[PDB]
Amino acid sequence: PLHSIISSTESVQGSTSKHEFQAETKKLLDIVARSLYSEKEVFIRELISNASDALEKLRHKLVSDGQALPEMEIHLQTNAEKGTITIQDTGIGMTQEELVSNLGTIARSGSKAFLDALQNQAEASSKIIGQFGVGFYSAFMVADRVEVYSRSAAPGSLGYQWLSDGSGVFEIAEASGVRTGTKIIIHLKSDCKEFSSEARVRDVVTKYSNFVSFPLYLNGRRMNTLQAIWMMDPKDVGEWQHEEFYRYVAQAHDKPRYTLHYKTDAPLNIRSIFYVPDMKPSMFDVSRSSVALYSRKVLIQTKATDILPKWLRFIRGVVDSEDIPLNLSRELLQESALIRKLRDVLQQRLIKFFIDQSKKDAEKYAKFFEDYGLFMREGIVTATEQEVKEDIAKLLRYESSALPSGQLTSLSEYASRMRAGTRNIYYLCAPNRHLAEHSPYYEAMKKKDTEVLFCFEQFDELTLLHLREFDKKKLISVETDIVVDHCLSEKETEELMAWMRNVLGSRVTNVKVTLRLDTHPAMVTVLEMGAARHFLRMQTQEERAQLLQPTLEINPRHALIKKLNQLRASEPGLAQLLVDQIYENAMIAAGLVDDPRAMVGRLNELLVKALERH
Template sequence: MSVANGLLRLQKLARPSFALARCLHPATGRLYHSSGRLQEVHHIPATASWTLPLSRSLTTKPAEDAGDSGYHSIIRDQEKTVGNSDKHEFQAETRMLLDIVARSLYSDKEVFVRELVSNASDALEKFRFLIQSSTDSSGEFVEADRSLEIHIGTNKQERQLTIQDTGIGMTREELIAHLGTIARSGSKHFIEQLKESGKGTQENVQNIIGQFGVGFYSAFMVADRVDVYTRSATAGSPGLKWSSDGSGTFEVQEAENVAVGTKIVVHLKGDCREFADEDRIREVIRKYSNFVGSPIYLNGKQANQIQPIWLMEPKQVTADQHNEFYRFVGNTFDVPRFTLHYKTDVPLSIRALLYFPEGKPGLFEMSRDTDIGVALYTRKVLIQSKTENLLPKWLRFLKGVVDSEDIPLNLSRELLQNSALIRKLRVALTNRALRFLHDRSQKEPESYDKFYKDYGLFLKEGIVTSQEQQEKEEIARLLRFETSKEAGRNVSLPEYCERQAEGQKDIYYLAAPNRTLAEASPYYESLKKRGIEVLFCYEAYDELVLMQLGMYLGKNLVSVEKEMRRSDSAKDAGADGVIEGSLLQTQIDELLPWLKQRLAGKVSTVKTTTKLDSHPCVVTVEEMAAARHFIKTQSHNMSEENRYALLQPQFEINAKHPIIKKLHKLTTSDPELAELLAKQLFSNAMVGAGLVDDPRMLLTSMNDLLQKKLDKQ
């Protein structure tokens, strides 16, 4: 006989005053009396059968029936109904509600185990409170010193799942009231009584999990019939049996040999026999009820062994405990990089333990389809293992637990009832995570820099996706960029702003693949000459991030390309308006319309600029970052004509540059060569601006220009 199929097989005998039990432990060969007391005997083969008188009372202390193997179970199939049963109908609309609960309220059938375990935990907490608050518990309650435990037994052959607790139990009136009406929660009623009496401390109230009265009925998702045996802890209370097939009626009958507490026997449907499997139930317990405050025994072995360390004082939790718990909740084998463990009661009651992973994110983690890795608990019972709205998507790399008794739950505990409250929790958690990261960046800059290298992309995603400017700026102070001031050193936006020149109202940034190209950019020339520091954005998406940020600490974020488009009329010109060393104004007036005609269909405007020194020309568009992103992602199927019509590029020439001066001469001496040169200059400028997705398209015009030049030799 296996442990999974029950270590105690009861055998009814002919004489009604007796019940005998076979009580041999199959693994150890030790004999167990059905009272729970260990009998020392010689080793006996597991195939042998033994019968012993079954006592009426039940001892539940683990020390009395836990042998060397650690086996401990209180489940005994010893109950016997007496007298006639009373048949009752469920109250108003219960048939319809039963159908809703059993068929549509819960998305996963396995949650019925969670609900029944939660009810059992509530019963234990109620009894614990009553014992602590009673002045004479020895006379008022039965077995007041018993251990408070939850026991679960599986029986594949009989397709049964049994859940038994040593809690407060129920009287006949409570049994009919709590199990006869859906949405009449015994836990909720108990909390109300505590508050009315003034005895309900915050801890007592918080420890009661159930807030709605439908969890018990979730058993009918998987059950043909549910039997409940219960005996109130109040002295003199009889044992009772409640039974129903969920069709709309239930029966209540007195019973003998019922232990104090409640025992639920779920007779499983044929297609739900998986819940009579020990491994399957252990998996569900580990998933949902691993942190219930009382021990849970499954077929005699304790099944919940992880301590809810998020409820402990942060200073009391060791590094080893954090590592073990992180591996448990994160389903990983590494250790956390950072640990955020905190509790607060303002604006919500929150107990949070969040881990920042040590390892680099993989491609799967980078996907926005990846689920949030933080579980939501209420009073140590899992509500959702991957809570979609608990944190913003950009924080999906976090692992851990959030526990809040302030979260009201839908009847099924699966759908969050108050989305506004969840949003409030989300904001509180997000702000706390941001403050934590900022604190790390100040106190542990080297560790933070490594984190930023691995997870900076998530922060940038947060700026792009956030709808709140304040949140954007909170994230932005965590960003790091190299600047034109010092190679190899990243700075934050606050640091950049602190050392800005007096009167500088903008934050300038330049997108380039690397520092060499950034420093050689024509767009950087003017700012470099003026000694203005510029942020260098080496990642393709950085400029989109800063464009979405828009402003930081009241200062506009401006790309150097946009700065170039601003008017620079005659800054470097002499009194007569002519720039030293440049084409004459009459020559400029001749060249500009000629260029616009030769580049018709490609440019919207041709103008001169005083912001170039070593470069002959540049191209600017209104929003360069958006334009570059468009070219890379969406312009492949567009014709060249439509692409230029959409971009509306502005062609700006440096009238001091030798190439531009030579171009002006060629317009009269060799118009054909001048046209080839003008088009090549424009193409080069487009490449420099990052507005050409495939430079190979320019090879033909470049070869034509070379051929034309060679023909002159």
């Protein structure tokens, strides 16, 4: 099954010619106005960006010669009865030649040539937005008649006009009484009449171009007073300015508990600010990342890229970077290499910032870890690289048996007080320290002088087994250690032992004797304690014990076993009920019971019949 017709019979016979590429001016307008911009109201973001560039060029022209700067304004006007929108600025304007060499050519921008003649690329390159040269034609998505009044800012120019309908032909004429600047009139389409009300227009100016560098007045009142604080050095912004900015972006009335101001340029240009809310996280935080990308002070509207790791979705802020590339739709080049390494750079800085906060303050960090501790545990579960797992693990907090109650210890702090050559870490799961010290598993491990961590909140067992390594040290649970290591007379015990081998031959697969108990009647040991504790939650009693292999232990010194001895002679009927309850008591003490409702019926039967002699 191999055949092809590829050969080298091709050759040139006649004299070669030369030609140049042309372009079709009608389909290009159709493509831009139909299958380029997904959302409709992006046509005023381009118009505002164009207005903010004319003002920037004029300001640069009046500082080289040291002239006085006049007023710089951007004015928006909406009409209902006429159904028209209006944009006006006070920029450099355009001459007769500039109205045809820029507005009449597709993919041609005059702002690009302005920077090419600067030979500096220091202050104006970071303040000019125009890059492609097709953003003006976005007005045709909602317009049938476009009307432009513009005259140059040169001392002695003449007013002009510009009319078109998007059919490939445009007419240009002269006008009288035109103010210096540029005014554009747009006639809305029949089905695009939603852009004639203040409610619709206000929802777009704030969303896209709220932080424009020049004052913006919408129908009389301005909306451009709050300044962008993520650009200047952190030494210029006070505590109040940080507080005010957080309330706007997060739409919250409280005070942030943490603030980060990151500014780096050697690896890549990054300007960003991050906030941690003071209030306890709500359920909307868990259910999906509160960070909006900004490039040259205009929204990028990512909403689908998740530039920050999913476990860091609880912080609010903005990120500004001019090194990221953008496509023709003014959106990210998805899954690009540059946008991937930015997340790794941002992730390592945030983890380092939290670690420094712990050293600076411990009581404040303890409150924060109690509230936002869920996200850190999730990040460990949903990570791949061990270096990522170990970095997050430094933020975890536990308490140990070698320290007084109520005091939290870090893993690193625990990792500094072992013996000479013991590469083991011991941890135990319990709801409270009261049950942790009274747990039968801990009582068996009192034979050794070692420090064991006490993790209380849920998912701790799941998190530790997923970490699986910390500083080349193995994490071993207390229950694992008991299995893996390698009164009543003897006559009175051997006769007792055969009973539960038969009466509990279904739910019990192993019964042994252990002296390591002092306050508990029985012990239940299982090989894979960690797996069994969590596989049970994912998923009757006979099935729950068939694959569990519930090895059972007894305490000969305990009075319960001592009292069960005479239970043979007096009332053998009660003996079966008692041994069943002891097994159920050990199962609950071992945490291998999903729900105790089933055993309630047997408990009532034993009590109402055993204590009748009172």
